[PDB]
Design a protein around this nucleic acid. Structure first.
Length: 82
DNA sequence: ATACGCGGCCGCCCATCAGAATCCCGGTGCCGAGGCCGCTCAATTGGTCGTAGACAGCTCTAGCACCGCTTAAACGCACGTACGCGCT
């Protein structure tokens, strides 16, 4: 019973834009948002996200720093736990 | 002149001696392992040298994997035409 939405390199822009525009709402019930490596750190940003859980290093240095950079940003106020 | 006798002929069952035919034992020709063998020239034996190629080190291509944006190609189904194939 966890409401979420995926984000990888398969869905077009018309769908991932609706997903990201739906996640940025302050009353969104999607507390889990899945991403990827290149698609996760592809671009844009998440302001309401703060917790970044990584399963394993994606065989690239600083790829984790740039991956958390999509959530850990300036607009975040309640700190960032990784 | 008138009546009796018979004579070989013959069907009959009944007897003797040779020939035909099946079984009990056979020789003959064909095929395929054997043996013999012997002059001998190709393999084996004992031996040296050297070189291919195994092997370990190394680096440095390219085969794999993996991902996602883009889209041509595959898919499945609907409809009918023009062939497969059956008959004569």
């Amino acid at each position: 019973g966890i409401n979420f939405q995926r984000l990888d390199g398969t869905v077009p822009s018309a769908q991932r834009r609706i997903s990201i525009d739906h996640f940025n709402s302050p009353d969104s019930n999607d507390f889990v948002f899945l991403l990827s490596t290149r698609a996760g750190g592809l671009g844009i940003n998440l302001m309401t996200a703060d917790t970044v859980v990584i399963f394993d290093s994606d065989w690239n240095p600083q790829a984790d720093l740039q991956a958390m950079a999509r959530a850990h940003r300036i607009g975040q106020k309640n700190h960032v736990m990784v």
